[PDB]
């Protein structure tokens, strides 16, 4: 189901304004998503088909996942969505990492502030780091490179008198055209087979990435993971999805021990 957030964003000091949809934008993307989207042949029989799901539809799915996570924790992923106060959800997630719930409630203001600042840092980090989305750009560049190569091969003679078929037909006669043409067919057919093979191999890599992204969506977003370094470095509390061009961005919220002290210990008393 498509879940929606409450009209009043009172989450006990926790501010999600950077990940939630911004109604002032015609695309209804979040502040972070909008940044990500800004950062990231025809006449030769080569075409491009549109995706079944639009960017708006993808954004709507993302919004539903965020709305569920915020208002009902991980319950919406295992059945009916059951509401719980956000601070109490965080308390449950603290217990999940071996920290008592009173730690959350006693430090609620500090924790909310640390969270809010950390999110703000993400927005700035991406804005000031051109290479941040290189992984998604690499996919775009590789596909563009393959098509440009395929088209340029149409300029090759492959042993023929001319790369241009119309030149052969207008100058040479039928017994001697079928020799020159066959050379072009062989080369052009080989070029196309090379392209397709490379696309199948690349497709496999993307599929594997998509399978991993789908797993992270289930285990990082729709629940709390105990798998080490699966949902970020540190002890996983929760994660938030953000859409991106041809990809997904996960913001992982983790708990990290900060100021340790030396103590003397014993196995038993």
């Amino acid at each position: 189901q498509i879940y929606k957030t409450p009209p009043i964003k009172d989450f006990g000091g926790f501010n999600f304004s950077q990940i939630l949809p911004d109604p002032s934008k015609p695309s209804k993307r979040s502040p972070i998503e909008d940044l990500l989207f800004n950062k990231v042949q025809k006449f030769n029989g080569l075409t491009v088909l549109p995706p079944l799901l639009t960017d708006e539809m993808i954004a709507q799915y993302t919004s539903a996942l965020l709305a569920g996570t915020i208002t009902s924790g991980w319950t919406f992923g295992a059945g009916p969505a059951l509401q719980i106060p956000f601070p109490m959800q965080m308390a449950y997630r603290f217990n999940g990492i071996g920290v008592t719930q009173n730690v959350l409630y006693e430090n609620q203001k500090l924790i909310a502030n640390q969270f809010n600042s950390a999110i703000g840092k993400i927005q700035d980090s991406l804005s000031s780091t051109p290479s941040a989305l290189g992984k998604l750009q690499d996919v775009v560049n590789q596909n563009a490179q393959a098509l440009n190569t395929l088209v340029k091969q149409l300029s090759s003679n492959f042993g023929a008198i001319s790369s241009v078929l119309n030149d052969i037909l207008s100058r040479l006669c039928p017994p001697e055209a079928e020799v020159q043409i066959d050379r072009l067919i062989t080369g052009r057919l080989q070029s196309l087979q090379t392209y397709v093979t490379q696309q199948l191999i690349r497709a496999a890599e993307i599929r594997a990435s998509a399978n991993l992204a789908a797993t992270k969506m289930s285990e990082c977003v729709l629940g709390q993971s105990k798998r080490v370094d699966f949902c970020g470095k540190g002890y996983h509390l929760m994660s938030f999805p953000q859409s991106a061009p041809h990809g997904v961005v996960f913001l992982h919220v983790t708990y990290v021990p900060a100021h340790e002290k030396n103590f003397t210990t014993a196995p038993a008393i």
Binding site: T54, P80, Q83, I84
Partner: protein, 114 residues
């Protein structure tokens, strides 16, 4: 102008009616005519309702057999506004036992060629 021609069909066990999508072109260049971002769709009736996607057309548009073929913007699911407040919790008083099926391929035919 040129492009691909795709035929949308319900299946011959149901009907012999078809719709044709002229991929990547204007409806004005083709000569129930609906222009989509996937191309010009002819033979399908556009509706302002929304359903689960049956036969994908592209760019948010799907088609199905309803008799005639219709074209619609696909639904992503029903809306649900959760009753959030800072002191309200929902707790299950009951449960169900569900059994679901998951199917995976393990192997393929072992062929050999001389």
């Amino acid at each position: 102008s040129f492009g691909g021609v795709s035929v949308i069909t319900p299946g011959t066990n149901t009907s012999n009616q078809v719709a044709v999508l002229y991929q990547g072109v204007n409806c004005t260049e083709v000569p129930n005519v609906f222009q989509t971002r996937a191309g010009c769709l002819i033979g399908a009736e556009h509706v302002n309702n929304s359903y689960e996607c049956d036969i994908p057309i592209g760019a948010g548009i799907c088609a199905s057999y309803q008799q005639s073929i219709i074209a619609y913007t696909m639904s992503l699911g029903a809306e649900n506004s959760v009753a959030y407040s800072n002191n309200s919790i929902a707790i299950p008083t009951n449960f169900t036992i569900s059994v679901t099926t998951e199917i995976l391929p393990v192997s393929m035919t072992k062929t050999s060629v001389d």
